[PDB]
Write a protein that binds this DNA or RNA. Structure first.
Ligand SMILES: [K+]
Ligand SMILES: [K+]
Ligand SMILES: [K+]
Ligand SMILES: [K+]
Ligand SMILES: [K+]
Ligand SMILES: [K+]
Ligand SMILES: [K+]
Ligand SMILES: [K+]
Ligand SMILES: [K+]
Ligand SMILES: [K+]
Ligand SMILES: [Mg+2]
Ligand SMILES: [Mg+2]
Ligand SMILES: [Mg+2]
Ligand SMILES: [Mg+2]
Ligand SMILES: [Mg+2]
Ligand SMILES: [Mg+2]
Ligand SMILES: [Mg+2]
Ligand SMILES: [Mg+2]
Ligand SMILES: [Mg+2]
Ligand SMILES: [Mg+2]
Ligand SMILES: [Mg+2]
Ligand SMILES: [Mg+2]
Ligand SMILES: [Mg+2]
Ligand SMILES: [Mg+2]
Ligand SMILES: [Mg+2]
Ligand SMILES: [Mg+2]
Ligand SMILES: [Mg+2]
Ligand SMILES: [Mg+2]
Ligand SMILES: [Mg+2]
Lengths: 77, 62, 102, 93, 50, 46
RNA sequence: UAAGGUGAUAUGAACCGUUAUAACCGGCGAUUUCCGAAUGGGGAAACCCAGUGUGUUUCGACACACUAUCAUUAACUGAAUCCAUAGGUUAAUGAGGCGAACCGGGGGAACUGAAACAUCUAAGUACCCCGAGGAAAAGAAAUCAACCGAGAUUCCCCCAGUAGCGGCGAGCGAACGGGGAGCAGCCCAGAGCCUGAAUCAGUGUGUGUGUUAGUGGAAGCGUCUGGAAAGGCGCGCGAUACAGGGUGACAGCCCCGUACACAAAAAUGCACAUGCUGUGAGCUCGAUGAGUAGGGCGGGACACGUGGUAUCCUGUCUGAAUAUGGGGGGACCAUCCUCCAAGGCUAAAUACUCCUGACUGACCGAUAGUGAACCAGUACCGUGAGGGAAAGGCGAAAAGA
């Protein structure tokens, strides 16, 4: 599924709105990317499917801290 | 007849069971041929088997 | 417990045989009783060739409602109502009128 | 060895008919109603133990029950297994 | 005051009804042939109706 | 003339039978509806 | 608990029983084929085919028990690759399915209204999906208010069809504040002290008190009519019982009940009392939720359609201060007031009824009332989803000629 493993960001629905305010249903998808993260502690790369936002979170909190949260939620990687 | 059966041992009960089953078989053949007037005996023996099996199950510890 | 039992001497309270006395032969589950010689019907019995064939107009007792008979108290010589009480641990029936055990 | 408990349940009744009678006095074959789930092996074992005769062979068939009305009240009779038991020559029952 | 004895004595008499002054109702007053009020009840009804 | 109903027991069971119904959530909803209504016969299964 | 009985059709056949192992009723047990989540594999449901291990064997064979998947945990094992990791095996524990409504969440119409129709409405409705409970959800102020104050949430009555929103159309429609129901507060982001002390919890034992069978339960005769009396008439009686049902007509006193008073070997609910084990309260000293608030862009929710538009949510791109600080008070600024986000838990008042018991109706009485008073979700119709009837009354008694 199009879900960020770090942030939990997923598709949300909303409308397109024309100039005449015609509403048609649309989705907003997260900016997801598969990325190999170097886990210095474990001397290996881990692949996560993460939003660009999630990648900023990992930069800030560090991958080790984030991987702990994944293990707590019970999300495999 | 549960009192007097409850005195008997497992091996004695197992022997009683076979006897009843042989009686049941004999009555069934008689009934089939039309040489059994006492139709009530079929039920008696059937309930006797059930009684023995019950007691066997108790002495097993189930 | 039942107030009217098999073998009780009863008197008929209502119906064509009002007043007549008799002994209770059978008590049916329906809440009816056969009383000897009371509620007689003339059955037109067909002959049954399978077995013996006594095909005729037979007179037999028909069941009467148990509430239509009363226990006959021979002392008073009248219909009586029944109550229950314990005497020596055992539940017994007694006549309401004179309080005597039945 | 088939338990005697089992053998005592498998034979249900003799089957009486013109065909059964002719089978007996022509081919030394007895016709039995047997338990629906009785195998040829069980039937053979039971007859040899309970009737005390030597069995050559058992043939079996399932009879399908008929639909029968009972005072404007319909119901299907049970299927039952019939066994043609051929006794060895010299045996009698 | 609703006398419990009087209440129990009147239960099985279908033509008789026993109320307290607070529990009077228009239909009852009309429905019965006679109305018996205790002196106390009269005082209470007065106060109830000013 | 050839009419629309041309019976095949195999096809009947595969299309509409109990196991076909149990195979999908919509099939299971059919059985739930039929049980709720109290049908004597849940499926074509004989 | 009992003089009768073994469920009915249902007649009789064979029987069982009568003072207590007949039967019947209640508690606790036992047994409980096959299919079905179906779980040893498979499969056209109710079937086909096994493996392993224990036994047993008259060597023909037989019995019994195990053997699904996934999650979690543990142990052992274990690649490419040296460690390792992935993977593998075994064990333990748990899950799955069903269910009328109510509940939370993820998605989400159209007819229709606007006398056309596109914004808007219908409506976050129908419906699909996921999840959960006996309720759910919500909940302990970064809330309101207005310089006076209030003090979590939920529900009801007002405020008010008001203020507003709105092709300013059709329509939509608050809050402040008041009256009520109910009321409750806590904990983590951390050590010391206290010591196992508040307290709840688990598991025993008591004592009350329900529930699950039951027991007793008042008092009427005469006469007339009639097929029959319970009706008429006469004269009595009971009533903490004249609710109701039955009985050959519409019975307080014939029967069953009713008011009222009693009852449990066994299991079990609830409220108190009290052993035991776990539990850390209280005090002191700290700490005080960051890709967060806020912002740009696009949407959504708020009565509010972006509008001068606050506040809330966030797909996308960014990005503070951190108590000398920060949020809110309907653009915005200043002042003042008020609160402390970015962690969590929490009873009651509220919603509903597949189901059980009791009672009630200016509710129906067989074309009505359920589709169904009756063997009806049946017959019948349809490949299927699905649709779906008709049909009650002899008599007091079968005395059914
Ligand atoms: K009264
Ligand atoms: K299975
Ligand atoms: K429309
Ligand atoms: K129109
Ligand atoms: K049009
Ligand atoms: K009279
Ligand atoms: K009577
Ligand atoms: K009449
Ligand atoms: K009556
Ligand atoms: K942001
Ligand atoms: Mg052959
Ligand atoms: Mg064959
Ligand atoms: Mg059958
Ligand atoms: Mg399977
Ligand atoms: Mg299987
Ligand atoms: Mg296979
Ligand atoms: Mg229109
Ligand atoms: Mg539950
Ligand atoms: Mg909750
Ligand atoms: Mg009694
Ligand atoms: Mg009485
Ligand atoms: Mg009449
Ligand atoms: Mg804000
Ligand atoms: Mg923001
Ligand atoms: Mg802004
Ligand atoms: Mg914005
Ligand atoms: Mg502001
Ligand atoms: Mg009519
Ligand atoms: Mg109808």
């Amino acid at each position: 599924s199009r879900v960020c493993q770090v942030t939990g960001k997923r598709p949300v629905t909303g409308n397109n709105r024309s100039h005449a305010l015609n509403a048609t249903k649309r989705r907003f998808l997260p900016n997801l990317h598969s990325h190999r993260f170097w886990v210095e502690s474990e001397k290996r790369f881990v692949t996560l499917r993460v939003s660009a936002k999630g990648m900023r979170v990992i930069d800030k909190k560090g991958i080790d801290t984030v991987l702990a949260e994944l293990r707590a939620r019970g999300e495999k990687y | 007849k549960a009192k007097e059966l409850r005195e008997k041992s497992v091996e004695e009960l197992n022997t009683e069971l076979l006897n009843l089953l042989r009686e049941q078989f004999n009555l069934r053949m008689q009934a089939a041929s039309g040489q059994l007037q006492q139709s009530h005996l079929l039920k008696q023996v059937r309930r006797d088997v059930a009684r023995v099996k019950t007691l066997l199950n108790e002495k097993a510890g189930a | 417990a039942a107030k009217i039992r098999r073998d009780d001497e009863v008197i008929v309270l209502t119906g064509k045989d009002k007043g007549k006395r008799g002994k209770v032969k059978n008590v049916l589950s329906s809440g009816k009783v056969i009383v000897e010689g009371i509620n007689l019907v003339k059955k037109h019995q067909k002959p049954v060739p399978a077995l013996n064939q006594p095909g005729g107009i037979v007179e037999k007792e028909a069941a009467i409602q148990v509430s239509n008979v009363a226990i006959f108290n021979a002392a008073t010589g009248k219909a009586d109502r029944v109550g229950f009480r314990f005497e020596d641990g055992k539940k017994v029936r007694f006549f309401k009128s004179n309080s005597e055990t039945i | 060895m088939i338990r005697e408990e089992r053998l005592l349940k498998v034979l249900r009744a003799p089957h009486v008919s013109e065909k059964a009678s002719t089978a007996m006095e022509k081919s030394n074959t007895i016709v039995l109603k047997v338990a629906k789930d009785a195998t040829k092996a069980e039937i053979k074992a039971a007859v040899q133990k309970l009737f005390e005769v030597e069995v050559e062979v058992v043939n079996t068939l399932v009879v399908k029950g008929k639909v029968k009305r009972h005072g404007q009240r319909i119901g299907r009779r049970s299927d039952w297994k019939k066994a043609y038991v051929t006794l060895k020559e010299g045996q009698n029952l | 005051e609703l006398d419990e004895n009087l209440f129990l004595a009147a239960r099985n008499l279908h033509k008789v009804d026993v109320r307290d002054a607070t529990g009077i109702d228009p239909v009852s007053l009309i429905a019965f042939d006679k109305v018996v009020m205790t002196a106390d009840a009269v005082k209470q009804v007065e106060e109830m109706l000013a | 003339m050839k009419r629309t109903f041309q019976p095949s027991v195999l096809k009947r069971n595969r299309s509409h039978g109990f196991r076909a119904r149990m195979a999908t959530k919509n099939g299971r909803q059919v059985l739930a509806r039929r049980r709720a209504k109290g049908r004597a016969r849940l499926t074509v299964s004989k």
